[PDB]
Amino acid sequence: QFHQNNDSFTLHFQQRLILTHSKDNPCLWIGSGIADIDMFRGNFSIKDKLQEKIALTDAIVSQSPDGWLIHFSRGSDISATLNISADDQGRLLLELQNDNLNHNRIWLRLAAQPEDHIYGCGEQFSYFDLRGKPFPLWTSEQGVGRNKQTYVTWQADCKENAGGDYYWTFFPQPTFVSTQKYYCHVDNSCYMNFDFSAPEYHELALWEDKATLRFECADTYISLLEKLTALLGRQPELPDWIYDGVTLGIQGGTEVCQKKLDTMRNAGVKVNGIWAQDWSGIRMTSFGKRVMWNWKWNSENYPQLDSRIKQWNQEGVQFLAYINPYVASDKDLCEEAAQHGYLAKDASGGDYLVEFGEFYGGVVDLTNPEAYAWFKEVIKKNMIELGCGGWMADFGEYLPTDTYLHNGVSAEIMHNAWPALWAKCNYEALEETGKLGEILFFMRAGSTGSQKYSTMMWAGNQNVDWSLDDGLASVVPAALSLAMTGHGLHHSDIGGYTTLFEMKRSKELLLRWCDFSAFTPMMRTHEGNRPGDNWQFDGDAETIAHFARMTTVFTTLKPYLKEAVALNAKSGLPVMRPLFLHYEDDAHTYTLKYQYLLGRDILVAPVHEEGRSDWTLYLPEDNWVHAWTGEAFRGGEVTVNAPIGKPPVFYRADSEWAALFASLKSI
Ligand SMILES: O=[N+]([O-])c1ccc(O[C@H]2O[C@H](CS(=O)(=O)O)[C@@H](O)[C@H](O)[C@H]2O)cc1
Ligand SMILES: [Ca+2]
Ligand SMILES: [Ca+2]
Description:
29% strand; alpha-glucosidase yihq; alpha+beta; alpha-sulfoquinovosidase; GH31; hydrolase; monomeric; 667 residues
C-alpha cells in the first residue's frame, strides 16, 4: 500500500505503517560526517565530526510494475533515491542510495506506535526490550561493569576506557523485531545507531552513502522467527554429547586435567568434557593467565594429550581447545602468515600488529581467500585432526579501522562483518571434515550470518559479581535478545569470568550460576582470568556435590533439550525463549528481562542476587508445577523458596514431558 500526494507519502506493508513522509515531517535525512574511531584493546572510542544533516523534504515518485522509485532532494546538489520493492521471497525491500559518496550519513525514520516493544539488535546485556533508548551497533569488547554508576565500571574506565556502557556488545546486529509483528534487517555493516526512544518513530542512523533494508511480517512471533531464520540462517543440531554433562574448564596441563576429572567423576558429577583453553601454552600478564596465541598443541604443558584425548573419549569425555583469528607476533603461525602475506596490513603496507594486552598479534586477513583457506587448515590439522571435540572460537570484535584488507573494503565496513566471517571459517572446517553435528565450537563475537555459521554462542565475559549489567543476570537478556535475532543456542561461563579489582568469585556465585546453566543447552565452566582468586568447581566437597546434583538435573533433561534443539534447527524456534512467544496475549510477559522459557514447558527465573533464600518471578496463566517440590501454581507474581540447588523452575503440568520433569524433585 503506497499512497502519495505531491511531496508526501505513506507506505504500509501487510497493514503495518512503515514509512510516512511529508515536507513537514520527512522520513529521510542525509549528510556527512568525519568518523574519528580509536581503539585500545578492543575498547572503541567512536567520535563523529558531523558536517551536515539535511532533511530531504522534496520527493518525486515514479512507479514500476515492480516497485516505486523515490527521488528525494533538497535542491539540485542534495538528493538520494529510495527504491521500494519486494525481494525474491516477497519481503519488503528498501534500497537507499545517496547522490554521491560525499554524503556518507543517512538517518531514516520508520513509523512506530508508542506502545510498541522492540527486541533483538543482536546480543544485548542491559536491555531486552530496547524501546526507549538508542543502541549504537559496533562490535567491540562488551565492557567491564557496563554501568557508569557502578564502581567497577569506573575503575575499568580509569584504567583503560574498559568499563563500557549499556549498549556495548561483541554481537550487535542491525536487526530488530517489533511488537507490530515484523522484523527489520539492515544489510549494511557500517557503524549504525538504532534509536528506539521516540514514541512515534524508530530512527536508524547509518554511516554510509547507501542502505538496504528488508522487512517481513507474521501473525505470531514463532512464525516471525521462522521467517527471520529463513533469511539469516539456522543453526545445526548440537552434538549428542553436549547433553551428557558439564564441560570442565581446566588449565595447567594434562595431569591437572586428569586429577580434576577424576575428582568430579568419582563424586558422581556427570562430565562430558574437558575444555583446556591453555592447550597451546599460557601467557602471564597483569590481566592474568591468558592463552599463548599460537594454535598448536603445546606438548610440554600437555604431555600425552594426543593419546589422552582418546582415553578420555573412551570414558565419554570430549576434549575442547581454544582458537581465535589472531596470531601471536612472537610465534610461528604469525611468522608463517607474514611470509605468505596472510595478515591485515597497515597504511605503510606492513603487517598490522595489534596490541592485545602486553603482547602483539597479527590479524589473519580472512578477506584473503588464501589466508582464509590456510587458517581453516590450521583448524583442521591442529585441532580437528588432534582430536578436539570442540573449542572456544573467540574474538572477531577487534579489527582496527586503519587496517587494510585484501578485498579492498574499508576496515570501517569490515569491522562489524568480521565475526560472521570467522564463524564461517570454523563452520567450513567442520563441514570439510564431516564433523557438523559432531564437533561443537562456541563463539562470543557475532554478526549477520552467525545464525548460520556459529554452532553455539556463549555470553562472553561476565564479571564474577552479581551486578545487573555485567553479572549472572545479564546473561538472560543476552540469550533472549539473541533468540529474537535468530540465534537460539546460548550458554555462559558457569561462574563468570572477569576477575579484576577485588571482584573474586564466591562459592555462592559459582553454585547459583551452576543452577542457572543446568537450565540452558550447555554446561561449561571457566577458571576466569585469575584462577587462584576464584572459587572453582572443586573448591570443596559441597561444591562438588552441588555439581553432581545439577549435572544430574541437566542430563535428565537430555531428551527434552534435544527436541528443543531440533526445533531450533528446523524452524528457528530458540531453546531459551521469551515468555511472549507462548503467552502473546499476556502484556506483562513483554517487559520481562530475567526469566525465560526453556523449550515450551519449563519456565526459569534464575536467582541473580547474592544472599537470597527466596525469589520472586512472574508465572503467566497456566498450570505450573514447581520443579523441586511438585507444588502446583497458577499465574501471577509469585515468591518461592530458592535455596542453592532448587532454582526457581516450574513446568507445565499439561506437558507431554511431565513425567520426566516430575523425576527432578527426587534427585
Ligand atoms: O581484550 N582483552 O584483552 C580480552 C581479554 C580476555 C578476553 O576473554 C576472552 O579471551 C580469553 C582467552 S585469552 O585470555 O585472551 O587468551 C578467554 O578465557 C575468555 O573466555 C574469552 O572471552 C577477551 C578480551
Ligand atoms: Ca494523492
Ligand atoms: Ca563484561
